[PDB]
RNA sequence: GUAUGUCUAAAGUUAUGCUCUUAUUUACUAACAA
């Protein structure tokens with residue numbers, strides 16, 4: 001489902017670059033990492049619960065046997 | 068200084084029995100080393116005579132390959148596992164009726180390995196020449 | 205004007221490690237060199253600045269391109285001024301040379317500094333290697349096999365019955381058979397099915413001129429390590445052979461190596477990449493050397509073997525003394541042939557007379573030349589008999605055909 | 607043209623590489639007894655072929671074959687004399703004694 | 710060729726009609742060769 005996040009980032013890049021490279025030509029030297037960074041933060045927000053559950057159960061199994 | 072290193076060494080170079088006892092391998096060290104080290108010098112000298120008959124090009128580098136052994140043997144840098152296998156080759160090389168036993172012993176010697184190959188391979192040329200030398204004689 | 209061409213021994217990793225690179229060759233100079241500014245090979249106008257070097261380095265940089273990364277020059281340049289200007293895996297000089305080979309496209313290129321009058325040599329070198337490096341040719345052939353498009357075209361013809369004469373020609377050779385490397389005791393199990401267990405075997409490693417049969421006796425310990433042993437047999441064989449070759453000197457390194465099993469050629473090609481001068485010869489003519497190990501004393505020695513050891517022999521001794529090697533080899537060929545047909549028959553022929561005695565060193569019974577001749581004739585009859593039995597057309601044979 | 611666009615390094619003089627040389631060119635500017643002799647006392651002080659003779663014997667195989675049993679005989683000669691030419695070691699002596707008579 | 714499953718991996722627990730000789734079949738099995 002991280003494909004969504006990845007896709008979003010791609011979209012941002014496409015958007016950003018072509019507002020970043022109006023008169024400027026092509027090349028790699030654009031920075032501006034904000035919105036993508038935002039995306040990743042929100043992905044982490046989404047997943048923090050999921051990983052608390054998942055890894056929770058995992059380490060529980062490591063410690064307590066499986067039910 | 069260097070003159071007394073010439074005197075003591077060249078005097079010692081002409082002072083040895085060119086013999087390998089096949090039972091003294093079991094004993095523990097410079098005796099077998101220098102026996103072999105100066106037996107090799109006789110294998111060198113027998114070459115030096117018929118250098119016109121034999122092909123001399125490979126020998127010129129054989130010399131440089133042998134130089135490690137000389138440095139190993141007179142110091143006893145050479146390992147017991149190597150030395151026992153090495154002396155086994157040279158002893159069988161003495162008797163003309165141990166040519167099977169000669170290369171036999173050489174193969175079990177060969178079977179870090181960068182100049183060790185070079186010199187060990189150089190020893191095979193010493194058997195190769197000696198085996199031929201006794202034939203064409 | 206090079207003082208020393210030393211190889212900086214890196215880990216095996218370096219070959220394929222891509223994040224970093226230690227220099228493969230380090231180049232100690234006699235005088236200071238005044239190398240040009242970094243540039244590509246085909247970039248002709250190499251600028252000689254006032255900077256000098258007392259020491260260069262040569263790195264190879266193998267790559268496997270795609271439909272998108274199929275230019276090499278750019279890549280090699282990148283590699284050069286990546287690893288130089290990176291604080292991991294420093295070269296002794298920051299000035300040096302870097303070659304890179306696109307294995308997927310056969311697109312060699314190299315970038316870096318240039319000693320004066322060096323570039324042409326490098327260009328020519330690369331051209332040569334690409335035309336025919338052994339390893340690279342093997343690779344192309346491997347890929348070709350992978351795509352089932354292998355054009356069956358050999359430069360040197362195979363050892364057929366006609367070229368058998370020109371086998372040997374005052375030329376140092378070696379001969380290899382991998383047939384009795386993986387022998388098996390078939391024994392029952394508790395479950396009832398068969399269980400194959402390895403026995404000690406050999407590496408039939410013969411020299412037709414001298415008659416010096418080397419054979420490294422395969423101790424079963426070497427199988428105890430791994431599984432899938434039929435392939436592993438080939439690998440150990442070729443490995444052992446390679447090792448043997450390495451051990452021998454540049455003069456006694458045998459030129460044309462002949463192989464019985466044409467399937468066992470494939471890994472040999474690989475383990476012969478240590479030294480390119482040793483030509484391979486796939487024999488068209490199958491020689492009986494499976495039955496070679498069913499000679500009494502040989503089999504005896506094989507059984508005797510306790511460890512990774514070789515015990516060479518002279519496959520024919522007295523014969524050499526009497527006659528040229530070829531003559532001896534014909535007799536040997538006959539004998540082995542007969543053995544292959546039938547062991548009992550062979551032994552019978554050998555031990556038809558019990559008065560004759562096999563010499564302590566010799567593998568074979570020392571006969572007088574007329575009785576020897578008779579024996580040979582008998583053997584030949586045995587072979588013909590076998591042919592008659594199986595092939596059912598041993599009567600109307602032409603000379604060459606025979 | 608992908609790898610051209612990817613090209614992390616593209617469109618440059620070696621301004622960064624000249625700075626590396628500058629950093630290292632500064633670093634350039636900033637910087638047996640008897641046994642040798644014991645070994646070097648000995649000299650170094652520097653510091654077709656025979657198969658053609660088979661090919662002749664196999665050509666001599668053509669001679670005995672061309673004398674007796676070429677094609678007419680199926681088994682009686684061209685197979686029997688076939689067994690008695692080229693294969694056995696005795697055929698060395700058959701030529702050798704013809705050489706010895708020729709000498 | 711495997712999953713898988715056993716095995717080994719060193720320290721001493723204080724008691725007084727048949728035997729035989731062979732040759733042939735068939736079956737099964739066989740990461741052994743063809």
Ligand SMILES: O=P(O)(O)O[C@H]1[C@H](OP(=O)(O)O)[C@@H](OP(=O)(O)O)[C@H](OP(=O)(O)O)[C@@H](OP(=O)(O)O)[C@H]1OP(=O)(O)O
Nearest residue numbers: 010011013014017018021025026027028029030608611612
């Ligand atoms: O569209 P994408 O598949 O995500 O690939 C883009 C795209 O390259 P393509 O158009 O060749 O696909 C961009 O090229 P332009 O459309 O902007 O011309 C390029 O952006 P730059 O031109 O700014 O380099 C960017 O490359 P980069 O990631 O180096 O910015 C690259 O993304 P990929 O390199 O991940 O394919």
